[PDB]
Amino acid sequence: RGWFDILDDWLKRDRFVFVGWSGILLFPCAYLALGGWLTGTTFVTSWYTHGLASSYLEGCNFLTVAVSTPANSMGHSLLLLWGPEAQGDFTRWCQLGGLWTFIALHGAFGLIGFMLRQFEIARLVGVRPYNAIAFSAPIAVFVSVFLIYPLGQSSWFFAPSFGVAAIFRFLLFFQGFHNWTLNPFHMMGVAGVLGGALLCAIHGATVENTLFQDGEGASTFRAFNPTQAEETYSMVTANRFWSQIFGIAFSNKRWLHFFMLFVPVTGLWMSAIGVVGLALNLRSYDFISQEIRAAEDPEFETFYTKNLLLNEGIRAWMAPQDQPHENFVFPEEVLPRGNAL
Amino acid sequence: AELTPEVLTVPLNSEGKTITLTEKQYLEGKRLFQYACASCHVGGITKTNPSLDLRTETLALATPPRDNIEGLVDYMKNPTTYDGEQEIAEVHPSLRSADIFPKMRNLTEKDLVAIAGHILVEPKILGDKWGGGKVYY
Amino acid sequence: SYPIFTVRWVAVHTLAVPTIFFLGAIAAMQFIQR
Amino acid sequence: GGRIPLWIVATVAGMGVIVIVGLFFYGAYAGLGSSL
Amino acid sequence: GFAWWAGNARLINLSGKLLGAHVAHAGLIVFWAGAMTLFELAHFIPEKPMYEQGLILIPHIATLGWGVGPGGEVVDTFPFFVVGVVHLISSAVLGFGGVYHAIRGPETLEEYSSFFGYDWKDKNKMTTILGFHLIVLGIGALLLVAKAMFFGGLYDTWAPGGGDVRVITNPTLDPRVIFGYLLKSPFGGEGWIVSVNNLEDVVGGHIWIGLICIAGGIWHILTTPFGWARRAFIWSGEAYLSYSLGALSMMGFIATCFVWFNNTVYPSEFYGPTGPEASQAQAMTFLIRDQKLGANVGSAQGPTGLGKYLMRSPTGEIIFGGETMRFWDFRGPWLEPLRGPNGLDLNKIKNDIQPWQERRAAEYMTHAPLGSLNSVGGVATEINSVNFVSPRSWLATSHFVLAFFFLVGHLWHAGRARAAAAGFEKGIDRESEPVLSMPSLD
Amino acid sequence: TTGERPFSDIITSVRYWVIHSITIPALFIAGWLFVSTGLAYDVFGTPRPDSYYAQEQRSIPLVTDRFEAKQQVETFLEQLK
Amino acid sequence: ANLWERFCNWVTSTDNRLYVGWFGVIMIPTLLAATICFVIAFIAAPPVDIDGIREPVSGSLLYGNNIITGAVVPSSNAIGLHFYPIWEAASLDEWLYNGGPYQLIIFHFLLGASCYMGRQWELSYRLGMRPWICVAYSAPLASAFAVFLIYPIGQGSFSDGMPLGISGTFNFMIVFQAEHNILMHPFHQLGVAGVFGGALFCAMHGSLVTSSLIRETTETESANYGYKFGQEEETYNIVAAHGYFGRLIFQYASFNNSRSLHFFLAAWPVVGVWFTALGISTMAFNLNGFNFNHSVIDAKGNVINTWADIINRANLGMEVMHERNAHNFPLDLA
Numbered sequence A: 001r002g003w004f005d006i007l008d009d010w011l012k013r014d015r016f017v018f019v020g021w022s023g024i025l026l027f028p029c030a031y032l033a034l035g036g037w038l039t040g041t042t043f044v045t046s047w048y049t050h051g052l053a054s055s056y057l058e059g060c061n062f063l064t065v066a067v068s069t070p071a072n073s074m075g076h077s078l079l080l081l082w083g084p085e086a087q088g089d090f091t092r093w094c095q096l097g098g099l100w101t102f103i104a105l106h107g108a109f110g111l112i113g114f115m116l117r118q119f120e121i122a123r124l125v126g127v128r129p130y131n132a133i134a135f136s137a138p139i140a141v142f143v144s145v146f147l148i149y150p151l152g153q154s155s156w157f158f159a160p161s162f163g164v165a166a167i168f169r170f171l172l173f174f175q176g177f178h179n180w181t182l183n184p185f186h187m188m189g190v191a192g193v194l195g196g197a198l199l200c201a202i203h204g205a206t207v208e209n210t211l212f213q214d215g216e217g218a219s220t221f222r223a224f225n226p227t228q229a230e231e232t233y234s235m236v237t238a239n240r241f242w243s244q245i246f247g248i249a250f251s252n253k254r255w256l257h258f259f260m261l262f263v264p265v266t267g268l269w270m271s272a273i274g275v276v277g278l279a280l281n282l283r284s285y286d287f288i289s290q291e292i293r294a295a296e297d298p299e300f301e302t303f304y305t306k307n308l309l310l311n312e313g314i315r316a317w318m319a320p321q322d323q324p325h326e327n328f329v330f331p332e333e334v335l336p337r338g339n340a341l
Numbered sequence B: 001a002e003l004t005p006e007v008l009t010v011p012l013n014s015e016g017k018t019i020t021l022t023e024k025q026y027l028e029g030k031r032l033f034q035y036a037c038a039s040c041h042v043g044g045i046t047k048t049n050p051s052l053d054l055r056t057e058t059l060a061l062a063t064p065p066r067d068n069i070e071g072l073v074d075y076m077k078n079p080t081t082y083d084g085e086q087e088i089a090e091v092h093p094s095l096r097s098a099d100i101f102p103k104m105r106n107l108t109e110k111d112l113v114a115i116a117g118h119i120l121v122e123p124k125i126l127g128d129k130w131g132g133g134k135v136y137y
Numbered sequence C: 001s002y003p004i005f006t007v008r009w010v011a012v013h014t015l016a017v018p019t020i021f022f023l024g025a026i027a028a029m030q031f032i033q034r
Numbered sequence D: 001g002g003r004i005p006l007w008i009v010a011t012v013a014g015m016g017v018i019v020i021v022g023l024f025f026y027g028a029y030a031g032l033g034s035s036l
Numbered sequence E: 001g002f003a004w005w006a007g008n009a010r011l012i013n014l015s016g017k018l019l020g021a022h023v024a025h026a027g028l029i030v031f032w033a034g035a036m037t038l039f040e041l042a043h044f045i046p047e048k049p050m051y052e053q054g055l056i057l058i059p060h061i062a063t064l065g066w067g068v069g070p071g072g073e074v075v076d077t078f079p080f081f082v083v084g085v086v087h088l089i090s091s092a093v094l095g096f097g098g099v100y101h102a103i104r105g106p107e108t109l110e111e112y113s114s115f116f117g118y119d120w121k122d123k124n125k126m127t128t129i130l131g132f133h134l135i136v137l138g139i140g141a142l143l144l145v146a147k148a149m150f151f152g153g154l155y156d157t158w159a160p161g162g163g164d165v166r167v168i169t170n171p172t173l174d175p176r177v178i179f180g181y182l183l184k185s186p187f188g189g190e191g192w193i194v195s196v197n198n199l200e201d202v203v204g205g206h207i208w209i210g211l212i213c214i215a216g217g218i219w220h221i222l223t224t225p226f227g228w229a230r231r232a233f234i235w236s237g238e239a240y241l242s243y244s245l246g247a248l249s250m251m252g253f254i255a256t257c258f259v260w261f262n263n264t265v266y267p268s269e270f271y272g273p274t275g276p277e278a279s280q281a282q283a284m285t286f287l288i289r290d291q292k293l294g295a296n297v298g299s300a301q302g303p304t305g306l307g308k309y310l311m312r313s314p315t316g317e318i319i320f321g322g323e324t325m326r327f328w329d330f331r332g333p334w335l336e337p338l339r340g341p342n343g344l345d346l347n348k349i350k351n352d353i354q355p356w357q358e359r360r361a362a363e364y365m366t367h368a369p370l371g372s373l374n375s376v377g378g379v380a381t382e383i384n385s386v387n388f389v390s391p392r393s394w395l396a397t398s399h400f401v402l403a404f405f406f407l408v409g410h411l412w413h414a415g416r417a418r419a420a421a422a423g424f425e426k427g428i429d430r431e432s433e434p435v436l437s438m439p440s441l442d
Numbered sequence F: 001t002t003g004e005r006p007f008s009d010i011i012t013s014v015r016y017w018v019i020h021s022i023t024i025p026a027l028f029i030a031g032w033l034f035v036s037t038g039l040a041y042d043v044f045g046t047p048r049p050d051s052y053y054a055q056e057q058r059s060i061p062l063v064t065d066r067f068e069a070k071q072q073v074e075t076f077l078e079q080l081k
Numbered sequence G: 001a002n003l004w005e006r007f008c009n010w011v012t013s014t015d016n017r018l019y020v021g022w023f024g025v026i027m028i029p030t031l032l033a034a035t036i037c038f039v040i041a042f043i044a045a046p047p048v049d050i051d052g053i054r055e056p057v058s059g060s061l062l063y064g065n066n067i068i069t070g071a072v073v074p075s076s077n078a079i080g081l082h083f084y085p086i087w088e089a090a091s092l093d094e095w096l097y098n099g100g101p102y103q104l105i106i107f108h109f110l111l112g113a114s115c116y117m118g119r120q121w122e123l124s125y126r127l128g129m130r131p132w133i134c135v136a137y138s139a140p141l142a143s144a145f146a147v148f149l150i151y152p153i154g155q156g157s158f159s160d161g162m163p164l165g166i167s168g169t170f171n172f173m174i175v176f177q178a179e180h181n182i183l184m185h186p187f188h189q190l191g192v193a194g195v196f197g198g199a200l201f202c203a204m205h206g207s208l209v210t211s212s213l214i215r216e217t218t219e220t221e222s223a224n225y226g227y228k229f230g231q232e233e234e235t236y237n238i239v240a241a242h243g244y245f246g247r248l249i250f251q252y253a254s255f256n257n258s259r260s261l262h263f264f265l266a267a268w269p270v271v272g273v274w275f276t277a278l279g280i281s282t283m284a285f286n287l288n289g290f291n292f293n294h295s296v297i298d299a300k301g302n303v304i305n306t307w308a309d310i311i312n313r314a315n316l317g318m319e320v321m322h323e324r325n326a327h328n329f330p331l332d333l334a
């Protein structure tokens, strides 16, 4: 019964918000990532890193406000407050993009803290730790996208900035420069997310329409008791229904709920891998066979060659404002354009 | 930067006399321009004839010159083609055609100056964006 | 016989307090003109 | 102890959000960020 | 049985309280029709087209021929005011009937009176209420006939001279015409009933529908439903709510297409040009501009080999080139003067275009029904400046959304009506699960 | 169920609203002042509407050095003095 | 015993391995027609002049496409919204050049899929079920109607409906963004919310049920064998799941009623997708995403760009390049 054990006691008390040992990492870091994002979006500009306004103070609304990435010139600098870039000056630190590293790193340690909490609470309660395991998928996306991707690039400048329209911009960048929609790892992600949403909706709907009549009321919610031993819907009728509508159905509730874990988690992991490739401009940009034929045969046209024309438009039209440090000057006559437009 | 009188100062006539608008006048003219003109001249272009714009250099070479308050107030009364040779009130909003262009009816003479002033100030602020088109959005 | 200050008290005010301050600043902001 | 009826708390809080968010939408049309 | 969030289902068998709900809701509808109009009129500026002003109800009144003269120029604003006031006033009376029947009046009607009281499963009573409402509907449709023929007429965008209010003296009664509309393809160049392009057919169809409605109203009063009908339908309040949710849904989709395509009962003078119209107007505008410059629009080959201004539709008709080739089915009063029987006539184009046609095309091209949710006008890459979203987009989008949700409402209530009728809407009896007495599939 | 005071019981209590009818507007006013005084601009370095560009300038003042970047935006800020 | 009553009995029989039903009577031929036509066109259709400008786009495998780039190409802009059955063509060669298969496929598919929804209602009634699973499916169905029918109706052409192909899909979503700024449209944002949240709650619910399986097996066998089909007891401990999840967040952000939970599971994605389907359906009538281009300017009136202006620059590059030969006049009004 020493101090360590006394603190364990106190951390693990059953209270409205459980603390745990993981709370020591989670809570400060989660609160600081979120404070940094609300602080930056309210007050802080992107003028010096990006030539953009990005805060409510400047006239931005909820969609356009962002905590923007540091200037490309900062490389992959940690941009510590006390570091040689900002030399302790909090004002300069904001103006140089320090809040982006602040948010990203405190955010990274918070996700760790959060998944530690999932492990901690599951051990204390005596459940298997599959919810923690599932949470590995959001971690993978976060690190690959916000950390790995810009680390393979020239700077943090090219990571996503923390904001609604700034993320939209990130999406469009990845189409035009990486042709990310063509990437089978994104496609596997798409099918995991869409497959997830489908499973979510189809499983909720099935339970609600194979219910057992357990209460007298038109409102079927009242007739469930959290401690009842009985399944509250018929798996048998659900199974016959889906077998006759769709041909196959689930017959094993355990497989079903595992598959629900499996689909979206795997989807996310696959997309993380592909972003890791893009860290290196290692893209699924082209099909070589298509380019060779099309170079030689100017009547050959597919949706594949149509979409690269659009990526070419995107790059040339957005690059100068989206990468100001490159001092891209594209005179009117070099801009790719179709007829009339 | 801000809306200083140097920028709010524009040619009155071809002689070279000048006039210094007020902020109020400039915003008056910007508002009036959105009301009566932007549907075709948003950002200084002309959607129904992209070949003719409201850049100052273009107005300078119009016949008669239109890079000044007098020439613009006149144009809003009796608009001509670019070489001056035909009056186009029948197809261009103007006081002379406020019967067919009803928005022009409640435009007073100071309204016309504020519209003209807006047109001459905006290129000094927006630069090549004024009448440059989507390339500069 | 309830406690007043709890861990709970603290998490609530850790968020609620700067939320209001922030709402006041963003309110003042709607009257800024160029 | 439990004096203010909860339904009153809810309506007044309710209209306080409406009010503040209305201000933000009004601000979209006035001043900074209005295009004007 | 029902929770607070399905609480209005507590009124299903409380006919007096449920009348209160309906009449109080009818009050809300008249209130908004009145209040909205007064809002629109208080904000209306006559110098400006209605479609630059966010107006959806003043356009409906002008269309009936009040307040406007030739060109759609507004002459008198008082008809608009009157319409607002009388709707607004009337809603206090429906409000009053509503709150009374919902709170103070008899909870159920069938004891105070065997006339107003009803049971949902009384197939005779229900068809009689149907009939009364059919007759009302019938009269309503004739009210429009009366206005068009005996009280001042309707606005006619096709009137020779730019449009004007005209009395309809020769409504179309020929059933080959009236009903022919109902058998045209809904596809392009046909457009089912959305293609009605003259007020004679509009007024004549309303003669027919009024008659038919009055007739069917009398029919359903005198009859009870036949056996094949008795066995095909679910007879309950929720079932009937479902039937009408479906019908409203279908009507809503039709209305969407009406306001989007039709420039006759939604004149473009008031509502703005249609999508197709604006797109035709652009090709017209540059055709006009370029030919004034000397260009030979008939002989000008465009990038693709297709004519730059003028080409052939798949059935040969001469039409505008560019992407608007898809819009060659458009007809509008500003364009038809140029149409000969092969389509657009090169000689009328060379020689007979007028300043007013030029003006109209320039206007409609710069008022195409494109804009952002925050009412920035034009293509989505356009800069701020023009505050504008066409009334047609506002009316198309709103009613698509409502039509859709009423279709979901139909499915929700129709499915539920079936299951409540068969007795398993609350779930599966564990002791008698139908599937457990059925053979296995394999 | 864990021993803290129920939330529903607090916000209807008279004592609660006696404190918070002060503490909430005070915080709302504090935040107002943070902005209305101009302090928020100076703390964070956020440009005021008149100080994005110098008068005849349309160059963004974009940071271009890693270890001289502090001196760079300091230079740009004096090009408004 | 009467012939027709016996036919009706077979149509509605719950003993057919696959339910037929009256909705099935329409669905089976329409979906066979659409499936068979699609399969043949994907492999072998010749190029289709999608944009009406005599610039045919090759979509099938035998014409130099792979699985990723091939598509059944939408019908000609020259046709617009006109109905183009085979028998309206001079010949199959004409019908193929102008993109007839697309119409045949999409009209049969939308019918057949509509009837699929109806079929979900009908078997639900024959089996004594509650009825609303079909309501869940109306969300994907609405989505398909938006991109194959609604958006074409408002833009005036099936040439702007979504291609039946992988890269054609991408083409459609890039052009949609240029012309409608769909990213900045609240209804698309609700779609993402509905799709991301759907995936999240799929994971959550799967991981929580999986976490709280009751030990019924040894370490050498799949846990799945701890559940037997049709067993009457539940196979996980929902109080244990509530106790873990309520403590992961706080008690009252966690469900203890399995009915409310599974209804929440159903509603969130269904409604999000209704909205994103409605986004497409209303951008069909060009009520586009929020436009904040040049919304922030300084004291002089210089434009201060935001992230919205960067988005715009990207949108503009899409705009000017798409259908690069099809536009003769300066605005792309549809």
Ligand code: CLA
Residues within 6 Å of the ligand: A024, A025, A028, A029, A032, A078, A079, A080, A081, A082, A098, A101, A102, A103, A105, A106, A109
């Ligand atoms: C507890 C969780 C936690 C975690 C995990 C972090 C983690 C981080 N923070 Mg954050 N921070 C926290 C809480 C936390 N912070 C709190 C509570 C505050 C409020 C003050 C802040 C405020 C804050 C700011 C303002 C900044 C960070 C930054 C950082 C980063 C750099 C930290 C670093 O280099 O440490 C270095 C120090 C250590 C690792 C300590 C090691 C302990 C040594 C080994 C013991 C030495 C003892 C000594 C020898 C004995 C006595 C000696 C003698 C003199 C007597 C990192 C991502 C920076 C950042 O994000 O930049 C982008 C940054 O600028 N933090």
Ligand code: CLA
Residues within 6 Å of the ligand: E003, E004, E005, E006, E007, E008, E009, E010, E011, E014, E017, E018, E020, E021, E022, E024, E025, E092, E094, E095, E096, E099, E102, E103
């Ligand atoms: C168009 C909207 C509408 C209408 C017309 C009704 C109408 C009705 N509801 Mg429903 N309801 C609605 C929406 C609506 N509801 C919504 C949105 C919800 C979800 C929150 C519910 C939830 C709900 C429940 C849970 C129940 C009802 C019940 C009822 C009925 C009796 C209520 C009663 O006794 O009031 C009692 C209320 C009062 C005495 C308060 C005052 C109310 C008045 C009418 C305010 C009017 C003010 C107005 C400005 C004055 C104008 C006066 C002038 C015209 C002279 C009544 C027919 C009840 C029922 O079925 O009873 C069997 C019931 O139990 N409703």
Ligand code: CLA
Residues within 6 Å of the ligand: E019, E023, E093, E094, E096, E097, E098, E100, E101, E105, E106, E109, E112, E113, E116
């Ligand atoms: C469709 C709507 C509707 C329906 C079915 C009913 C039905 C009923 N009402 Mg309710 N009521 C309504 C609307 C409705 N009312 C409205 C709008 C008001 C406010 C004006 C009232 C105010 C009201 C009161 C104050 C009372 C009732 C009562 C009753 C019951 C007996 C009425 C009777 O014998 O009148 C017999 C016939 C008449 C009175 C003839 C009236 C002729 C009408 C006014 C002309 C109709 C013209 C046209 C259809 C209306 C449109 C005009 C407009 C477009 C300009 C009965 C169940 C009574 C009750 O139940 O008490 C316990 C009662 O005291 N009602």
Ligand code: CLA
Residues within 6 Å of the ligand: E127, E130, E134, E182, E183, E212, E213, E214, E215, E216, E217, E219, E220, E223, E224, E225, E226, E229
């Ligand atoms: C609100 C309007 C309305 C409603 C709800 C009803 C409701 C009813 N009618 Mg009445 N009816 C009405 C108006 C209405 N009627 C009018 C105005 C008339 C006069 C013409 C009639 C004349 C009438 C007769 C003569 C009969 C009924 C009968 C019935 C009952 C059976 C309905 C049925 O099976 O239809 C279902 C319809 C079918 C199964 C076949 C319809 C096929 C059409 C072509 C479908 C088209 C759908 C398509 C998508 C839309 C395009 C339209 C097309 C022309 C292009 C039911 C109570 C029957 C009954 O029992 O009466 C006592 C009966 O014999 N009705």
Ligand code: CLA
Residues within 6 Å of the ligand: E004, E005, E006, E007, E008, E009, E241, E245, E405, E406, E407, E408, E409, E410, E412, E413, E416
């Ligand atoms: C004529 C139209 C009509 C009528 C009379 C009914 C009637 C009824 N419905 Mg149906 N329903 C309809 C249309 C209709 N519905 C449509 C179009 C849908 C599609 C979504 C549904 C879907 C539906 C469901 C899913 C259920 C019902 C149910 C019911 C019953 C109780 C509903 C209740 O108390 O609501 C109470 C009202 C509320 C809880 C408030 C809802 C408010 C909506 C969601 C928000 C809209 C907000 C607005 C657009 C923007 C806000 C702006 C802000 C500034 C305020 C009642 C018999 C219930 C049932 O089956 O019981 C028999 C039920 O479970 N309805």
Ligand SMILES: C=Cc1c(C)c2cc3nc(c4c5[nH]c(cc6nc(cc1[nH]2)C(C)=C6CC)c(C)c5C(=O)[C@@H]4C(=O)OC)[C@@H](CCC(=O)OC/C=C(\C)CCC[C@H](C)CCC[C@H](C)CCCC(C)C)[C@@H]3C
Residues within 6 Å of the ligand: A029, A030, A033, A034, A037, A038, A103, A104, A106, A107, A108, A109, A110, A111, A114, A131, A132, A134, A135, A137, A138, A142, A161, A162, A163, A164, A167, A193, A196, A264, A265, A268, G196, G199, G200, G203, G204, G207, G248, G249
């Ligand atoms: C954008 C999509 C998205 C969001 C917003 C999101 C959000 C969340 N998911 C959580 C959980 C989960 N997510 C899961 C699966 C998934 N989650 C997904 C997608 C998302 N998940 C997908 C698609 C899946 C499917 C595999 C699982 C399985 C779980 C959980 O178990 C867990 C939970 O409890 O869910 C109910 C919660 C973690 C809370 C937390 O860490 O607190 C601590 C907060 C911390 C550490 C701060 C992190 C700081 C972040 C990373 C950077 C800063 C962000 C800014 C402040 C805001 C930026 C906003 C602009 C970008 C617009 C949180 C509600």
Ligand SMILES: CC1=C(/C=C/C(C)=C/C=C/C(C)=C/C=C/C=C(C)/C=C/C=C(C)/C=C/C2=C(C)CCCC2(C)C)C(C)(C)CCC1
Residues within 6 Å of the ligand: A031, A032, A034, A035, A036, A038, A039, C014, C015, C018, C019, C020, C022, C023, D017, D021
């Ligand atoms: C960064 C930093 C830091 C920290 C910070 C913090 C921690 C902050 C916090 C902050 C916060 C914490 C904030 C908050 C705010 C919030 C807000 C601003 C909110 C808003 C809201 C709203 C507006 C909403 C509304 C609504 C709507 C709209 C709808 C729905 C409903 C509701 C009501 C929700 C320090 C110092 C360490 C130092 C370093 C740097």
Ligand SMILES: CC1=C(/C=C/C(C)=C/C=C/C(C)=C/C=C/C=C(C)/C=C/C=C(C)/C=C/C2=C(C)CCCC2(C)C)C(C)(C)CCC1
Residues within 6 Å of the ligand: E020, E021, E024, E025, E027, E028, E031, E085, E088, E089, E091, E092, E093, E094, E095, E096, E098, E099, E102
């Ligand atoms: C039952 C119920 C309900 C409902 C209710 C309702 C819906 C109501 C109605 C109501 C109504 C619906 C109302 C109405 C009203 C009206 C009024 C009261 C009017 C007024 C007017 C006036 C008085 C006029 C005046 C004027 C003139 C004459 C001229 C111009 C100007 C002016 C405007 C000034 C609720 C939900 C709540 C809940 C439960 C129960």
Ligand SMILES: CC1=C(/C=C/C(C)=C/C=C/C(C)=C/C=C/C=C(C)/C=C/C=C(C)/C=C/C2=C(C)CCCC2(C)C)C(C)(C)CCC1
Residues within 6 Å of the ligand: E177, E178, E179, E181, E182, E193, E196, E201, E202, E203, E204, E205, E206, E208, E209, E232
């Ligand atoms: C006014 C007008 C007009 C005319 C119109 C008319 C005269 C219409 C008619 C209409 C009609 C004449 C309609 C009808 C409709 C029908 C329907 C809509 C029906 C439906 C049906 C159902 C829904 C069924 C169901 C079922 C089945 C199928 C089986 C068994 C079961 C049941 C019965 C459920 C015109 C355009 C010239 C012009 C302008 C104005």
